[PDB]
Design an enzyme around this catalytic site. Sequence first.
Site, PDB file in Angstrom:
ATOM      1  N   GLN A 105     -35.834  68.965  57.645  1.00 40.86           N
ATOM      2  CA  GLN A 105     -35.731  70.025  56.657  1.00 40.86           C
ATOM      3  C   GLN A 105     -36.997  70.907  56.669  1.00 40.86           C
ATOM      4  OE1 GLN A 105     -35.616  69.038  52.537  1.00 40.86           O
ATOM      5  NE2 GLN A 105     -33.768  70.225  52.128  1.00 40.86           N
ATOM      6  N   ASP A 108     -36.462  73.184  59.977  1.00 46.26           N
ATOM      7  CA  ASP A 108     -35.399  74.174  59.727  1.00 46.26           C
ATOM      8  C   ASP A 108     -35.892  75.314  58.830  1.00 46.26           C
ATOM      9  OD1 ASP A 108     -33.490  75.388  57.711  1.00 46.26           O
ATOM     10  OD2 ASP A 108     -31.906  74.332  58.863  1.00 46.26           O
ATOM     11  N   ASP A 110     -38.907  76.384  58.365  1.00 41.42           N
ATOM     12  CA  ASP A 110     -39.967  77.155  59.042  1.00 41.42           C
ATOM     13  C   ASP A 110     -39.249  78.137  59.955  1.00 41.42           C
ATOM     14  OD1 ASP A 110     -42.002  78.048  61.120  1.00 41.42           O
ATOM     15  OD2 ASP A 110     -43.298  76.496  60.255  1.00 41.42           O
ATOM     16  N   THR A 184     -39.894  83.656  59.905  1.00 43.78           N
ATOM     17  CA  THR A 184     -40.208  83.906  61.290  1.00 43.78           C
ATOM     18  C   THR A 184     -39.555  82.869  62.162  1.00 43.78           C
ATOM     19  OG1 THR A 184     -42.257  82.580  61.130  1.00 43.78           O
ATOM     20  CG2 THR A 184     -42.429  84.839  60.595  1.00 43.78           C
ATOM     21  N   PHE A 186     -40.590  81.823  64.896  1.00 39.94           N
ATOM     22  CA  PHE A 186     -41.554  81.007  65.624  1.00 39.94           C
ATOM     23  C   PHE A 186     -41.944  79.835  64.754  1.00 39.94           C
ATOM     24  CE2 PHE A 186     -42.145  85.455  66.592  1.00 39.94           C
ATOM     25  CZ  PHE A 186     -41.862  85.462  67.918  1.00 39.94           C
ATOM     26  N   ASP A 188     -44.266  78.193  63.311  1.00 41.60           N
ATOM     27  CA  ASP A 188     -45.597  78.640  62.986  1.00 41.60           C
ATOM     28  C   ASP A 188     -46.137  78.260  61.576  1.00 41.60           C
ATOM     29  OD1 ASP A 188     -43.817  80.253  61.608  1.00 41.60           O
ATOM     30  OD2 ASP A 188     -44.937  82.097  61.985  1.00 41.60           O
ATOM     31  N   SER A 190     -44.737  78.867  58.755  1.00 45.43           N
ATOM     32  CA  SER A 190     -44.498  79.961  57.848  1.00 45.43           C
ATOM     33  C   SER A 190     -44.037  79.431  56.510  1.00 45.43           C
ATOM     34  CB  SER A 190     -43.481  80.932  58.445  1.00 45.43           C
ATOM     35  OG  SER A 190     -42.399  80.230  59.056  1.00 45.43           O
ATOM     36  N   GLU A 258     -36.478  72.381  46.154  1.00 41.77           N
ATOM     37  CA  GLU A 258     -35.063  71.984  46.118  1.00 41.77           C
ATOM     38  C   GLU A 258     -34.959  70.504  45.920  1.00 41.77           C
ATOM     39  OE1 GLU A 258     -33.374  70.099  48.734  1.00 41.77           O
ATOM     40  OE2 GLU A 258     -31.271  70.256  48.165  1.00 41.77           O
ATOM     41  N   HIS A 351     -27.587  67.236  56.997  1.00 41.74           N
ATOM     42  CA  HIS A 351     -26.995  66.988  55.686  1.00 41.74           C
ATOM     43  C   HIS A 351     -26.310  65.617  55.603  1.00 41.74           C
ATOM     44  CE1 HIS A 351     -27.062  71.517  54.400  1.00 41.74           C
ATOM     45  NE2 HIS A 351     -28.265  70.961  54.450  1.00 41.74           N
TER      46      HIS A 351
HETATM   47  C1  HEM Z   1     -30.571  68.994  48.784  1.00 37.67           C
HETATM   48  C2  HEM Z   1     -30.656  69.304  50.289  1.00 37.67           C
HETATM   49  C3  HEM Z   1     -31.195  68.505  51.186  1.00 37.67           C
HETATM   50  C4  HEM Z   1     -31.709  67.088  50.885  1.00 37.67           C
HETATM   51  C5  HEM Z   1     -31.365  66.462  49.735  1.00 37.67           C
HETATM   52  C6  HEM Z   1     -31.145  69.180  52.462  1.00 37.67           C
HETATM   53  C7  HEM Z   1     -31.592  68.674  53.649  1.00 37.67           C
HETATM   54  C8  HEM Z   1     -31.553  69.291  54.858  1.00 37.67           C
HETATM   55  C9  HEM Z   1     -32.055  68.737  56.087  1.00 37.67           C
HETATM   56  C10 HEM Z   1     -32.791  67.377  56.200  1.00 37.67           C
HETATM   57  C11 HEM Z   1     -31.830  69.642  57.068  1.00 37.67           C
HETATM   58  C12 HEM Z   1     -32.191  69.512  58.571  1.00 37.67           C
HETATM   59  C13 HEM Z   1     -32.358  68.324  59.172  1.00 37.67           C
HETATM   60  C14 HEM Z   1     -31.157  70.749  56.475  1.00 37.67           C
HETATM   61  C15 HEM Z   1     -30.701  71.833  57.129  1.00 37.67           C
HETATM   62  C16 HEM Z   1     -30.335  73.013  56.539  1.00 37.67           C
HETATM   63  N1  HEM Z   1     -30.053  73.202  55.184  1.00 37.67           N
HETATM   64 FE1  HEM Z   1     -30.142  71.835  53.729  1.00 37.67          FE
HETATM   65  N2  HEM Z   1     -30.604  70.430  52.294  1.00 37.67           N
HETATM   66  C17 HEM Z   1     -30.315  70.546  50.953  1.00 37.67           C
HETATM   67  C18 HEM Z   1     -29.743  71.652  50.369  1.00 37.67           C
HETATM   68  C19 HEM Z   1     -29.444  72.820  51.018  1.00 37.67           C
HETATM   69  C20 HEM Z   1     -28.804  73.967  50.428  1.00 37.67           C
HETATM   70  C21 HEM Z   1     -28.301  74.055  48.986  1.00 37.67           C
HETATM   71  C22 HEM Z   1     -28.669  74.918  51.365  1.00 37.67           C
HETATM   72  C23 HEM Z   1     -28.033  76.330  51.168  1.00 37.67           C
HETATM   73  C24 HEM Z   1     -26.744  76.416  51.948  1.00 37.67           C
HETATM   74  C25 HEM Z   1     -26.038  77.747  51.829  1.00 37.67           C
HETATM   75  O1  HEM Z   1     -25.366  78.249  52.805  1.00 37.67           O
HETATM   76  O2  HEM Z   1     -26.137  78.314  50.709  1.00 37.67           O
HETATM   77  C26 HEM Z   1     -29.234  74.376  52.581  1.00 37.67           C
HETATM   78  C27 HEM Z   1     -29.373  75.050  53.746  1.00 37.67           C
HETATM   79  C28 HEM Z   1     -29.710  74.527  54.967  1.00 37.67           C
HETATM   80  C29 HEM Z   1     -29.772  75.281  56.227  1.00 37.67           C
HETATM   81  C30 HEM Z   1     -29.518  76.789  56.489  1.00 37.67           C
HETATM   82  C31 HEM Z   1     -30.819  77.576  56.193  1.00 37.67           C
HETATM   83  C32 HEM Z   1     -30.584  79.054  56.370  1.00 37.67           C
HETATM   84  O3  HEM Z   1     -30.624  79.603  57.521  1.00 37.67           O
HETATM   85  O4  HEM Z   1     -30.326  79.703  55.336  1.00 37.67           O
HETATM   86  C33 HEM Z   1     -30.195  74.255  57.266  1.00 37.67           C
HETATM   87  C34 HEM Z   1     -30.381  74.487  58.772  1.00 37.67           C
HETATM   88  N3  HEM Z   1     -29.705  73.107  52.340  1.00 37.67           N
HETATM   89  N4  HEM Z   1     -30.983  70.512  55.134  1.00 37.67           N
HETATM   90 CA   LIG Z   2     -41.549  80.093  61.203  1.00 33.40          CA
END
Ligand code: HEM
Ligand SMILES: [Ca+2]
EC number: 1.11.1.7
Length: 595
Positions: A105, A108, A110, A184, A186, A188, A190, A258, A351
């Site tokens: 998380q 992702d 970053d 970003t 990268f 990095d 961020s 979150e 998730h």
């Molecule tokens: C609560 C939430 C988490 C833990 C209890 C959780 C965890 C992760 C992990 C460990 C991820 C990668 C290994 C991961 C990926 C991405 N998430 Fe998620 N996440 C929780 C809650 C949310 C919520 C709410 C969202 C919003 C979803 C939407 O479409 O509204 C969410 C997003 C994402 C996401 C997309 C980011 C983006 O480009 O906007 C991952 C790649 N997470 N989560």
């Molecule tokens: Ca970044």
Amino acid sequence: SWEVGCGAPVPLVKCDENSPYRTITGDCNNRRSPALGAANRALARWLPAEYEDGLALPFGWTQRKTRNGFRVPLAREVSNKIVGYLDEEGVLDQNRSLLFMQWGQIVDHDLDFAPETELGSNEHSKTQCEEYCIQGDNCFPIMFPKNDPKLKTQGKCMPFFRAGFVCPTPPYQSLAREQINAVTSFLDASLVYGSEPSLASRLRNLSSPLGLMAVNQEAWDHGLAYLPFNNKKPSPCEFINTTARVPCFLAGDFRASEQILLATAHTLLLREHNRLARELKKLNPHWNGEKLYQEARKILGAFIQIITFRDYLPIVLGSEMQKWIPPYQGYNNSVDPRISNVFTFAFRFGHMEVPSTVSRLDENYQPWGPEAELPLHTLFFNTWRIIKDGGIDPLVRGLLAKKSKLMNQDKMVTSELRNKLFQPTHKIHGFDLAAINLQRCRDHGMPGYNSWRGFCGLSQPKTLKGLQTVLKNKILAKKLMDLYKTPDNIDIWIGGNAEPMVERGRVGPLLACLLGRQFQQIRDGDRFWWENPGVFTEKQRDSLQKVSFSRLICDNTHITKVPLHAFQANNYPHDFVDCSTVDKLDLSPWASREN
Ligand code: HEM
Ligand SMILES: [Ca+2]
Ligand SMILES: *[C@@H]1O[C@H](CO)[C@@H](O[C@@H]2O[C@H](CO)[C@@H](O[C@H]3O[C@H](CO)[C@@H](O)[C@H](O)[C@@H]3O)[C@H](O)[C@H]2NC(C)=O)[C@H](O)[C@H]1NC(C)=O
Ligand SMILES: *[C@@H]1O[C@H](CO)[C@@H](O[C@@H]2O[C@H](CO)[C@@H](O[C@H]3O[C@H](CO)[C@@H](O)[C@H](O)[C@@H]3O)[C@H](O)[C@H]2NC(C)=O)[C@H](O)[C@H]1NC(C)=O
Ligand SMILES: *[C@@H]1O[C@H](CO)[C@@H](O[C@@H]2O[C@H](CO)[C@@H](O)[C@H](O)[C@H]2NC(C)=O)[C@H](O)[C@H]1NC(C)=O
Ligand SMILES: *[C@@H]1O[C@H](CO)[C@@H](O[C@@H]2O[C@H](CO)[C@@H](O)[C@H](O)[C@H]2NC(C)=O)[C@H](O)[C@H]1NC(C)=O
């Protein structure tokens, strides 16, 4: 691409071209194409968007338009029949600690963030959508199935708002709709420093010129730093407990609070920045406030890249790693460093890795108090349990001692997230992350599942029998076909996650290709990748190969027992050594003598 120049989002400014430091925005990484990889621009499109009307309307929008001849199934119904389960017993990953779920998380966040369209702190549109479930404009609600319990208890739908898109926020006139990435591409750091010129500065401590990040002034963790509170009321962290009245944390990335465990991680990272900066002042007393900042920053970025590339990806990608991410051969200015739209759903595999509870452990790694284990759902936007319950040390040991949840075709996403998710804008713990993620594939115009198998050069099943063979599961394959009626119609997120795992990995072949390619590109496309000749010195590089998340723990908390390999499952005390022993980041290669 190529309607070539659109986009007002864009912050507008200039490149130094000889600066040893990344911009905050990502601009200027690429010399002939300075905006490639910057925040506030479109997610890249590895394949053309697939929208109901070919331009911007998602599938499922118009009730009688089909996809390939069939009705796409409801987000939430796919959730109820495929995603949910009741029994948490046996669901833990024997060979991955909770920190495995959690580093993912961080990485992702970053890398990508497609924020929702807000479009007014005014309208009964955050209410015309909430209350009446009327689909329209940016309201695109998740309707409930017949037989869904939430009907009896919550209402008729869950509110959902379409994601932000380039160029405007008003209904745009013409190209094909593209979602913004607000951070970003990268790797990095961020998420610690901010992606904007506005935020990055507000986060810094510019009273003292020691290049420190600002810290909380109202509260301490045994004389260790906490993040500054965020200014903005209404505050969801304030809402979950109005008695404690503790606000969310102010960090480089908006989603920091979150969940208590994610806020925990952010805290360790802020702490390492200050630690690193005060250490640096010690070595270079002449060094400036800005230089202190930029140099700690630069190191923290190298650190996240290393842990990610050396420790984390090999145990996600497994045997597939080296077929997608060969060894580094040097910066390639031709590689497109941008996060693709599909990556932001592929990365959502994490998730399925989230367990139903979180533990606080005491110094002997024992249950810390009587209310030691908590259900995940009471930790969304919960900062009070940090500040008014013993700091982060107890959660940090939980991160090392407890295990991730294992993806499992029958037990897919925990009810803590599938039924009881708290969204920062509404009042109830009662949202479904699974359905959301599904509604969001559709929102982003994702191609279906067979388009992606095709892209990754993998077979494309067209029949139930075809599907069972790929998924290696009769039961699951029939549920999907009943719902989707053709594999071509399977939403990528659930198609990708339904595949069995590759050897030593935690994702299947489809995901490993998508994850794999993105990471290869963000590394090959990054002028500031830590191994790139001239970014760091050979000697600095030698000292950075010694970083480890365990050290990070030792230097920034009061834990003295850590495992050497934090991401695998570790039993206390057998796998636990003395902090006083773990390789330290030798920090003298950074000395500067003027004669
Ligand atoms: C609560 C939430 C988490 C833990 C209890 C959780 C965890 C992760 C992990 C460990 C991820 C990668 C290994 C991961 C990926 C991405 N998430 Fe998620 N996440 C929780 C809650 C949310 C919520 C709410 C969202 C919003 C979803 C939407 O479409 O509204 C969410 C997003 C994402 C996401 C997309 C980011 C983006 O480009 O906007 C991952 C790649 N997470 N989560
Ligand atoms: Ca970044
Ligand atoms: C639990 O997961 C562990 C981590 O993934 C796993 O061990 C890891 O397996 C890889 C596979 O090759 C090994 O990687 C390194 O092996 C030797 C060290 O003996 C190095 O010299 C090589 O260069 C290579 O990179 C490791 O052996 C290991 N990774 C770590 C932490 O160093 C365990 O085997 C898993 N446990 C079970 C029971 O499945
Ligand atoms: C809202 O947050 C409150 C505090 O932030 C929290 O209440 C606190 O939690 C428990 C009550 O269950 C108490 O913990 C213990 O504290 C003293 C030590 O000084 C013990 O002797 C007590 O017996 C008790 O076990 C805290 O005292 C209590 N704080 C306050 C202000 O009452 C609430 O639980 C939170 N409410 C919700 C619904 O989350
Ligand atoms: C900015 O940094 C300064 C200097 O580190 C901080 O002030 C010091 O730290 C604490 C805060 O009360 C105390 O030891 C002293 O009052 C200060 N000592 C010195 C050397 O000035 C200050 O907290 C930081 N400001 C913010 C908002 O983070
Ligand atoms: C740098 O990376 C680019 C990323 O697209 C690579 O693209 C290659 O383009 C060249 C044409 O100049 C051809 O070799 C191939 O069509 C592409 N490679 C493959 C097999 O995909 C390229 O490999 C890299 N270039 C250098 C000079 O290292």
